[PDB]
Amino acid sequence: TLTVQILDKEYCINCPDDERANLESAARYLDGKMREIRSSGKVIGADRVAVMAALNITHDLLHRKERLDQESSSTRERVRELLDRVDRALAN
Amino acid sequence: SNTLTVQILDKEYCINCPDDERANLESAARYLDGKMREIRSSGKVIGADRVAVMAALNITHDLLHRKERLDQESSSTRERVRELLDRVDRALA
Amino acid sequence: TLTVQILDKEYCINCPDDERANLESAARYLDGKMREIRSSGKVIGADRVAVMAALNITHDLLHRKERLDQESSSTRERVRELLDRVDRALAN
Amino acid sequence: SNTLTVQILDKEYCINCPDDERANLESAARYLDGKMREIRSSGKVIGADRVAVMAALNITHDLLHRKERLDQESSSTRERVRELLDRVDRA
Secondary structure, rough: OEEEEOOOOOEEEEEEOOOOHHHHHHHHHHHHHHHHHOOOOOOOOHHHHHHHHHHHHHHHHHHHHHHHHHHHHHHHHHHHHHHHHHHHHHHH | EEEEEEEEHHHHHEEEHHHHHHHHHHHHHHHHHHHHHHOOOOOOOOOOOHHHHHHHHHHHHHHHHHHHHHHHEEEEEEEHHHHHHHOOOOOOO | EEEEEEOOOOEEEOOHHHHHHHHHHHHHHHHHHHHHOOOOOOOOOOOHHHHHHHHHHHHHHHHHHHHHHHHHHHHHHHHHHHHHHHHHHHHO | OOOOEEEEEEEEEEOOHHHHHHHHHHHHHHHHHHHHHHHHHHHOOOOHHHHHHHHEEEEEEEEHHHHHHHHHHHHHHHHHHHHHHHHOOOO
């Protein structure tokens, strides 16, 4: 169980040991983004600042998720292309 | 560089967003709203602001877990390939 | 259980059904090589004629084995080089 | 383009073998001798000539079986490859 502090509040979450540091980065990002929005005075309400912060990080995570899905699809295709040639080489 | 409007947990948000990002922001907002919805439903956390933070944490956890699960599938596939290699090699000459 | 005729002599041998044709082909080769040697007057004795035939067939068979051992080695090295590329493609 | 002399089952044979073939013939004669001896050891076939004919047949069967066995190893390796692909494609 990991506990991170985001904008004057404490959150206790459950996560694999292999994710601790990474989730702490997400917390640090949230915290900073929130402080930025809060001090911008353009978003009224604590809940509003949190959703804007959360929407921002969800927007970056989706892009990293898209890049991940591309590289994963490229590897899968090269592997499929290579295994297919092993098959042919064995057929003759 | 125009205004985009999205609904998130029964509230509206007008955001200045780049054109080639619109679809991405809407997806994010959609995904966010969805995650925030099922988190408020659990009653495990109280406070709209906290619901948003936890939602961001879980979505983060989902990507990480997606990647680890990918690395592990890639790792096992590799062991099977070394097994296939070591087999076509036990028949050496 | 195949039966072939090789120069006025009958031979009953045990072999996989998927080999009958090839073994018969072997018997035909021996049979004709034996008739050629016998009608050459160069080799005296039924056994010496049979050995010379057998040596001639063992000689072609070892050459066929050399090529078979080559092709198989080439395939083996190509499959080995291909599966190694799959390993690399998955490592990153 | 000369004469090679090999020992095959206690008789001698002087063949008119080509130069770049000598090593091959000696090997074959060496291999032939080996099978004829085994066939003689197992009192089953009567006749030096029959022993040579059976020896040539066994050696034939040997290469055939060596081949079928190699085609079966490749066949099975291919199945394992399709399995590995299917699993990869199963994602």
